[PDB]
Amino acid sequence: QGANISDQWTGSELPLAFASDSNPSDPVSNVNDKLISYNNQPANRWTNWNRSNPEASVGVLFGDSGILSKRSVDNLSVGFHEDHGVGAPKSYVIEYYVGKTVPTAPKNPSFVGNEDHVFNDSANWKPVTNLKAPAQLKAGEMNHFSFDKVETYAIRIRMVKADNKRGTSITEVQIFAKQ
Ligand SMILES: CC(=O)N[C@@H]1[C@@H](O)[C@H](O[C@@H]2O[C@H](CO)[C@H](O)[C@H](O)[C@H]2O)[C@@H](CO)O[C@H]1O
Ligand SMILES: [Ca+2]
């Protein structure tokens, strides 16, 4: 297992977690802060609980030594959280950035859908290929995904909430460079 290329680094803008939208008290910066909690002691999670769109994406924009960098990516791990109102999503696509335009850091990363940004244009994304995933997603553990290696500025997971919940919930993601 190589470098963790998703963790926040102190005094560095990158790498940076981003989301299309969020529950304001559950900001998307929670998914790469190296805290993992499946309860409220402490509560630590991104969610879109009680937001208007049932679908939302969460992603990592990559960095090397403080500045923007393409990374070679073939994996993703997601720790889904559940309670009475949030849970793992009923469906998901895992996508990577292909835009010719070099992406900038969003101004408000927890709510990328609310500003003009390359991430909001679906022509800038393609699905990963030859995905290996769990047969069923589970809250309460890191769910591991792998796929064909790609050189990208960013990957995201785009998710629709389960019908019996008010949002999707993630305590932490982790992405690793090749050994
Ligand atoms: C008693 C009551 O309804 N309290 C609510 C809280 O549930 C709510 O917090 C959110 O709850 C959802 C539960 O699925 C999830 O845990 C979210 O992460 C969390 O923010 C709060 C919203 O600020 O309002 C209270 O009314
Ligand atoms: Ca976390």
Experimentally, how was this structure solved?
Answer: X-ray
In the reported structure, the alpha carbon of residue 109 is separated from the centroid of ligand 1 by a whole-number distance in angstroms of: 22
Total count of residues recorded for the chain: 179
Q: Give me the residue label for tokens 């529950």.
A: 23
**Ligand 1: residue whose CA is nearest its atom 8:** 49
Q: What is the largest CA-CA distance in the chain?
A: 43
Report the distance separating Cα 138 and Cα 169, nearest Å. 11
In the reported structure, the alpha carbon of residue 162 is separated from the centroid of ligand 1 by a whole-number distance in angstroms of: 17
Residue 47: CB within 6 Å of ligand 1?
A: yes
Report the distance separating Cα 48 and Cα 6, nearest Å. 21
CB 157 within 8 A of CB 76: yes
Token pair of 141, please? 């553990």
In the reported structure, the alpha carbon of residue 34 is separated from the centroid of ligand 2 by a whole-number distance in angstroms of: 5
Q: Is 35 annotated as belonging to a binding site? A: yes
Please give the radius of gyration of the chain, using alpha carbons only, rounded to the nearest integer.
15
For the chain, the structural domain boundaries read 1-179
**Nearest ligand by distance to the CA of 162:** 1
What one-character DSSP code corresponds to residue 109?
G
- How many CB atoms lie under 10 A from the CB of residue 160? 15
CB burial of residue 8 (10 Å; 0-12, 13-18, 19+): middle
CB 34 within 8 A of CB 174: no
- Name the pairing type of β-strands 86-87 and 167-174: parallel
CA distances (Å), origin 42, targets 19, 88, 94: 22, 19, 28
Resolution of the model in angstroms: 2.1
Q: Which of 22, 40, 49 to mutate to test the pocket of ligand 1 (most atoms within 8 A of CB)?
A: 49
CB 26 within 8 A of CB 16: no
**Topology of domain 1-179, CATH:** Jelly Rolls (2.60.120)
CB 160 within 8 A of CB 19: no
